[model samples]
Target: FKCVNSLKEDHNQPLFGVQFNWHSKEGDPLVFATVGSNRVTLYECHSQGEIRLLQSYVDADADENFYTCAWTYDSNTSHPLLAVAGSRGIIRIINPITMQCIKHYVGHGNAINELKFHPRDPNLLLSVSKDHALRLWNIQTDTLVAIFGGVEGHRDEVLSADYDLLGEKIMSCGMDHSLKLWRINSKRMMNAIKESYDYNPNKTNRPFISQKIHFPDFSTRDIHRNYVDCVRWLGDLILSKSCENAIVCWKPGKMEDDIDKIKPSESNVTILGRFDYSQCDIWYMRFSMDFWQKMLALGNQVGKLYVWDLECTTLTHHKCGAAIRQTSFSRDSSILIAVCDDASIWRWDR
Candidate 1:
């Protein structure tokens, strides 16, 4: 996968996130969003592995830097909306084509590190914040759907969060050095918040502080030593990483593991195996796995890209620059992309 393409001018600020819009159908444009400083640039990945800056949106205020972004669709016409948020705690929903800021969402008290749209419903957006909590928002009405942290949640900054492929479970990890798993008790929880605000004559943030927390299924602080920066789902299993030199693949047991004393297991969260040869020791650097589940890739501080095929557990390496901030894949699996801390973009074609 050494077909590399370079983005010329410097970004001036390090890029923190790059997400490909999930699987576009045949003949559809392949789009992605990258955020940094005060700008979010939308780019198109051409057939020949060329990247064109389609459009970009900026904040003239210059008060904060953008951190992460995700793609969702409009509830009405099904047009795509890019959810980009940052250090100033403001989320902007932008139209990828025109790069226009369609709506601004505010709720998190601190910086948001990551944002994820539910796999099945584009209206349900999930966010992980430095405020030590994970939030679910209903984009349709700007309603706060659910908050996933309470007294038992992450006591430190939450860095990453994602929904499982089935959208039935949630996985998050962060500065607390712990990885957490949660179950969406019911879809009714989504509507629960919407109905509360609907019954009010004049609604405001009154419902924000009044909302209850959705708890966790289980949390494993013993698994990682350093702050866990990224966590994603692989079917019902898990893939998580810290600056701890290894990426651990694990699985979560039943909530009843506590009360089912008859057949007690060692622990609720079980470690499957560790994917190694990673030299990443910094935060906010992300990783990727292919749609076919054939390989996994990550970048480290020494400018080396690593890809591991679960077969016999061997790893492959590539180089793009001095430091890579994040990694991702194209919609058709045509190429793999890595964003550097120096603000350059690199892609390896098939």
Candidate 2:
């Protein structure tokens, strides 16, 4: 793949996230979004493969640094929508054409760590925060649908979460040293008592409750010696990266099979493979967007990016000049996007 690097644009702050606008309304104009400090900037990809700044957004009054952002799926809206979250725990829905915030969501108690649109529903969203809460929201109505925290949630900062391919489940990792799985539409467990509806004399009853109660279907025991940083679903397996400098894949067997295969007390999840990234600590990992390709990308604190196959064999490596923040693959798997701390986005074309 030939590579084209951006002319160093200094943001004077670390770049936190980057996403390709594959779902733009005007599909012909290739675009992507990035955030740093108190700004979110959109860029257009030209025919020559270079990027031109399309627009810049800043809320000087807020002055909060953005941490993550996501693009809505094409099915949800006629116009493209972008959602961004920052250090202040505020979520903003932007009308890309107007470059203005049309809506806002507030719930998280601390810095919002990550944001993701539901793979199946464009109006649905999931966010994790430093307060150890994972939330599900309906962005279209700015409604908080559920809060996946409290008694059974992570004990520390929740860093990342991803929807399973089926969009029926979520896999999340955090400093709590575990990976937890939750069903998207789980009924309240037997122990949870539904809150009673009381008539409000001063106001009308809301269409929905402020939040719904949900809990994880299952969670892994402390798999790493230290905190888990990020977790991702790779087809039928689960992959996680942590502060221990190791990447591990877990293959979960049928929960029912535990009845006869082993004692009922035994665990069904087995370690499929473990690869050591001893050179540096890894913070980001992503599978290729194309389901047919069995590849993974890893980004570390140092300026290194490595692409590896299923067996943990390194396929390629790029020594970027700054700390790698995040990575993404094009929809067709023909290109890879890497955003670095030096405020440059690199495009690798296959």
Candidate 3:
């Protein structure tokens, strides 16, 4: 945790997501969630190690709004934007400057597990829920463009999702031991990588021997022995959660034989690198910068922060306790923020 220096006594309670504005002109502003009190806290930092509270959103009349997820501004927007995934599965788009809610979405049937913004399309946002579904939203229109489902979604929840750099396809990994690939046409779903759970060897559909059951022939790379809590897609690489406390990377859309040839135990399993942090499971992971010199950041269920320099093959572990929900890097790659369950925000130099 060389780069992580805890700003103690400020975290009032359990925090979920912490972030700094990518478009911020001065030092980026940091925002975090309080899961215990159901509130949002914002901050702006300066030279004196001064982290000041800039804004907060806590409605006394509303029920506990679990703000588990958030996204920052893209290049086009001068104003910083953040989205929160509520406990009720509703989404709140917040403008920290005005301290107001810009958009609210109530579409999911259960709790929203995660939220992410398309890198190029600021209006394009993705979300997942315990209801076994993935939804694409146009934040500007407050309309649903595409809604897709995985009947075999994670048994517990749809943990995380991401759109390809081109914004043409979407990938999601859930708790039900399933990974889904969806083809989107405009705001509608065209096709999906469907995985069936009911397996019968005699019926031609063989049970998945490796990860989880998806299709007759398709299954997960066998490297992950436990549930895959988080997954992120890099250019040709896929970073996945593993029970072994090491992040696994594999190339996708390859021939099974080619994949197997790379790593027989786990098709396409590269084991590119590992971040040592006891036995913590990274629930959410994100990649920033470019595929080259990229900064790979992931957060765990135990609130430890893992930073990997893909180019240098170095990993740094930041211990922040219990903040396992989500993480993101500021647009400029200067600051890294993570959310903790205690509703506190944490930031570190990138």
Candidate 4:
């Protein structure tokens, strides 16, 4: 499997995100990071052939336009931190070795489409917003420790989120069709909604809406009829994508005991499979590295690239004819990055 395309003389435009540096440095050389328009790039790959551009950070007097970026590590930290989220619903935390931006993370009021960095809590941070909020930050005391909105959240624009392998669950995706599941101890559900508004000291209506707020612990029965863009964590299984063009696969059987006023018209989540895509609409999907056995990678919006295995079968396909925007896996999953919106960056090695 060999495919490479690197070319980005100032990233012309449209190339959302791509990450790797999953705590890099073991046996050295294999760095990556990417974001678009208002740039932030860093790439490196040694012995295994071509991929170089080890340092880039463009701003040109910001007017905000970076979609996502992450890589944070801690073994008692020394360096290896970078969390850039954009469109201005801010989130900085740089230090990609003194290219310093250190910290600045205001709570999104709109636009942080995705930002994850809590594989095992290196000071935790989970962001997802377009103002339908789903936050949780604590970059070592720059606090804002939890704010997973209500009306059961995600009513529109909450693109993608992940962290579900013993990182104690959190999987999101939305435009409104649904796929929610949170609980990173959300500060104990915000102290049980502030102890039911302090045992009613005239609790008018402010537990963010006191119908005694409670909803978010598993959703998606709307069957992704449309708008559920991307979500992943396939080792307990759950991989989504939307505009309803298919790529479902959600399985969390038996969790029906008052799962937070259970909605999606009524819960009991389970749909362990689906993967159809005729006229292509899926925009991104990933899994590789024991991914419970072999591969699975999809990309679309017309760039075509599917590769499934582990029963949902479809082992090879390719098309990079434009608009694939972000897909990654390479911590020895032997490379497979694809961030194309025509501004190229596609590698597939194996």
Candidate 5:
């Protein structure tokens, strides 16, 4: 990847997160979102290599910082919706065409760390937060499904999480050094809980009601051995990272006790491979995996970008100034984008 473009802000606020629209119209400009301190901006990457900021919406107060954003389709409206959240703990759903916030999702007790839309059902959103909980929301109906936390939830801030490709499972990790896998209940069960939430003592269809709390199916802290800042599902396996100089690959087991089986190497969630790097002791740095190209990219503490091609088993590093908080690949893997602590967006194209 070569640096194709660089955009910066004079405000000097660090950029925290970015992601691409996984599904977009064919032959149209590719849509992407980069969110930071006080604003969330949508940019379109044209086929001719021209990138333009289509719309940017700022927070009400200069102190309210936005960290992460996600884009998914609205199954009911036949349009794509963007989700943004951060410092204030409120999630906002934005309509890209009008570039306006259509709905505000409020519930997280602390700042939201990540937002992931379901792979099959676009209206469903999975959110993780500093409050040490994971939430599932039906954005279309303005209802909360279930909160995945109890006495068993992450003890500290949840740094990252991901929905499996089939959307049947969730994997989360955080500051407490715990990695958890959860099996979501059926839609019927979730909807039934929603229907049961008709009134409070004051009697109203208000405050977005769902009284269900979920616990993890499998939990352990042996994988990353430190604060696990990022986690993603790779087919049936996992790719997770801490500041511990390497990303570990593993797989969850069929039964909870399968964790003990040393025989049948494929039956447990044990460490399989390690993608090692140096000078990687930075918190909240995220990695990106491109399934189309079978490649993985991550940024380290001291301004280095590591790209590992899974197919070729080759690793390469590039000098990108400042800590890269997050990295993203365009839908086709033609353009790789990185947002840094220096408040700049670095665009690298194939």
Candidate 6:
């Protein structure tokens, strides 16, 4: 991985969301979300190194309002939709082309920390916050259908979530040092399994939803020494990066009790494969091109970034000087967008 280009900003608050759209026949457009003086802004970018302020929208007297944003797929329209979660306990749905709020998703009682769109279903959206609950929204009807949380899982705040390739499941971690698995139920599909007394009941389980839901449960309690900032579901295992300078990979088990039988020698996980950074900590990570290739990129607290090729067990690392809050890949998998703490975006060269 190499720093192909570096963009800078003086704002101190961290940048939350970064995305690129290749759905258009014209050209690829890169977008990033950030906060500056109580305002949330998104930047339109081009690879030729010109970042134009295509649209600027403002919040009136929204003092101290912190928010995160995401991109939505538009089948009926040409413009991409934007989802912004603000500290005022609201999610702002925006149209990038017109630079206006399409709708406001209001429900969460506390500050919203992360927001993401389901990979398979464009209408499905999920948001987590310092409130400790994860909520799912249907943008078409603007309805909040499902809510899941564990009182003991993330005591402080919830960080991020990554849905699987098919969008049937998601993996999440937070300040609680725990990673959780949530199975997505599709009303369009036929029910394949019947309920049994031995299996956990879906209706009455509350937080767990389906008590019978097969969970290969794994927690970061042992390996991660501090808060888990980001996590990804890579193939059959889960990968977690934390503030303790450790990146842990875990395989799910058949039963919850299987946790006791997992020893370091018998485990199919790797923990704390440290980067070359001395005292820096990783805050975010994601796979570069494809999942099977076993390639990944991680951004740290000190603005240092690292790349890994798990097939060859090799490492490549660098420094950007600003805490990398979030990083994402382009649609073609050729470019990487690294959003820094200063609300600036950097494009990575392959």
Tens-digit lDDT track of model 2 for 103-199? 8887789989889887767777899999988988766555566788878778899988988886767888888787877765435421121221232
Ranking the candidates on TM-score from highest down gives 1, 5, 2, 6, 3, 4
Ranking 2 against 5 by TM-score, winner: 5
Residue pairs with clashing backbones, model 6:
200-211, 200-212
- RMSD to true structure for each model, in Å: 3.6, 4.6, 9.9, 16.6, 4.1, 7.3
A best-first ranking of the candidates according to their lDDT comes to 5, 1, 2, 4, 6, 3
**Candidate 1 structure lDDT:** 0.76
List runs of model 2 lying over 4 Å from the truth.
25-27, 73-77, 187-204, 211-214, 253-268, 282-293, 310-319
TM-scores of the models, in the order given: 0.88, 0.84, 0.71, 0.32, 0.88, 0.74
Clashes of 6: 2
Candidate 3 per-residue C-alpha lDDT over 1-350 given as tens digits, one digit per residue, 9 for 90 to 100: 23443453353555554545544554445444333346666666544334566777774446665646555664455567878775778788777777787768886898886787876666677888888777776665345655665333344567677666666556677666555555453222322211112333466654323222222112353546555666677764566664556666655434443322332133333345454545364444333332233677666565666666666232334445564555666555666655556554565664
Colliding residue pairs in candidate 4: none
Which ranges of candidate 3 are over 4 A from the true structure?
A: 1-12, 25-36, 60-67, 72-78, 150-156, 185-223, 253-277, 282-293, 299-305, 312-327, 338-347
| Residues 55-124 of candidate 1: C-alpha lDDT, one tens digit per residue | 8788866877989888887767877788888898888888777878878878788998888888887888
Q: What TM value does model 6 have?
A: 0.74
Q: In candidate 3, how many Å is residue 111 off? A: 0.3
Give lDDT per model, in order.
0.76, 0.70, 0.56, 0.68, 0.79, 0.61
Q: Write the per-residue lDDT of candidate 5 for residues 1-350, one digit (tens) a residue.
A: 76667788656789899898877877876878888888888888865467887888877778888888988886766678889999889999888888887989888999998999888878778899999899888776677877888776778999899988878778889999988877664565446445634434356645655645545667777787778988888877789998888889886654343432423223245567999888778678898898473889987766767888887232233545588898899888888888888788877788
